[PDB]
Design a protein around this ligand. Structure first.
Ligand SMILES: CCS(=O)(=O)n1cc(-c2nc(Nc3cc(Cl)c(N4CCC(N5CCN(C)CC5)CC4)cc3OC)ncc2Cl)c2ccccc21
Length: 312
């Protein structure tokens, strides 16, 4: 009974982009860094090109395309279009700094409280928007949050995303308990995974329930155990996490409340995260054309335009 979905599916010519390097590869497929140069437009758009190594693969690729062509938010991944190759390619905005999980591990000693709490605000704004569109992500985790710049992050990987009805290689350590036992998925089960994601950020990228078998997790959670309080976490921040991990899903916070709560803490960050040497920290974000010549491995980057500025 929803409204008609009038999103546009853009079909892009494979001839007008260059694959530059593998970003990631697995059985799921490969993702390439690349440049998109629409003919006659005088712009070079950095992109990630997602592709598979099969009619069953094209079905799932196009389902993801259906989802991503229908979302438009600054904190959700941007689909530029698709290419009709033997196997369909998904063309997305390149996020130059990789995944937030890798970003907080590599930059652990230079990440202060202001950045941590702003990421929590932004992820929550992304999820609140997905809720507004009646979409349940189902795979929220720090590995599925990407870094456009250290000041801006976006939720990605909708390969499991679904349209809610208060109803439904699964990542068990990020899942609500009612999803682990009953395969149910709500926005409130995304709040649980939101809690685990914050925990990952607050511990600078530790694996949740390290060493423990996923076979074991459901019983841990039934006993009442949860992830521990991270050293830098005041009880204000830790309490919010613990609320995302409650048994009654209607008792967990709403994404619009998480926006409000983390936003207030981002006003006085040192009062909520306690990090050795917080005032002395700074993270590099070169927006300039020198930065893209190095990442794209191209001599000429004068006409480079980020996808967020390239509209039609
Ligand atoms: C998230 C699941 S996804 O299937 O939906 N997915 C979406 C994208 C994607 N990535 C991007 N940029 C992007 C992503 C990544 Cl991780 C990297 N890393 C650099 C560090 C590498 N480390 C590895 C560990 N070592 C210790 C140090 C170096 C690893 C790769 C660089 C990037 O750009 C410069 N921009 C848009 C999209 Cl859409 C993606 C990329 C690879 C694999 C799956 C992907």
């Amino acid at each position: 009974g929803e409204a008609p979905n009038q999103a546009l599916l853009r079909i892009l010519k494979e001839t007008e982009f260059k694959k530059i390097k593998v970003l990631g590869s697995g059985a799921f497929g490969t993702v390439y860094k690349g440049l998109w140069i629409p003919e006659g437009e005088k712009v070079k758009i950095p992109v990630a090109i997602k592709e598979l190594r099969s009619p069953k693969a094209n079905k799932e690729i196009l389902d993801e395309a259906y989802v991503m062509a229908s979302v438009d938010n600054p904190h959700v991944c941007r689909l530029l279009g698709i290419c009709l190759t033997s196997t369909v390619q998904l063309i997305m905005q390149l996020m130059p700094f990789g995944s937030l999980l890798d970003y907080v591990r590599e930059h652990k000693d230079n990440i202060g409280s202001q950045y941590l709490l702003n990421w929590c605000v932004q992820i929550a704004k992304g999820m609140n928007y997905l809720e507004d569109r009646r979409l349940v992500h189902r795979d929220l985790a720090a590995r599925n949050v990407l870094v456009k710049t250290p000041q801006h992050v976006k939720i990605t990987d909708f390969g499991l995303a679904k349209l809610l009805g208060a109803a439904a290689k699964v990542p068990i350590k990020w899942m609500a308990l009612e999803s682990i036992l009953h395969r149910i998925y709500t926005h409130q089960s995304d709040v649980w995974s939101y809690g685990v994601t914050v925990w990952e950020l607050m511990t600078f990228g530790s694996k949740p329930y390290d060493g423990i078998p996923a076979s074991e997790i459901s019983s841990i959670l039934e006993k009442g155990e949860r992830l521990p309080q991270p050293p830098i976490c005041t009880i204000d921040v830790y309490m919010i996490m613990v609320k995302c991990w409650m048994i009654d899903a209607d008792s967990r916070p709403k994404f619009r409340e998480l926006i409000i709560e983390f936003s207030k803490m981002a006003r006085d960050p040192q009062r909520y995260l306690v990090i050795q040497g917080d005032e002395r920290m700074h993270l590099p974000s070169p927006t300039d054309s020198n930065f893209y010549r190095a990442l794209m491995d191209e001599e000429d980057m004068d006409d480079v335009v980020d996808a967020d500025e390239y509209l039609i």
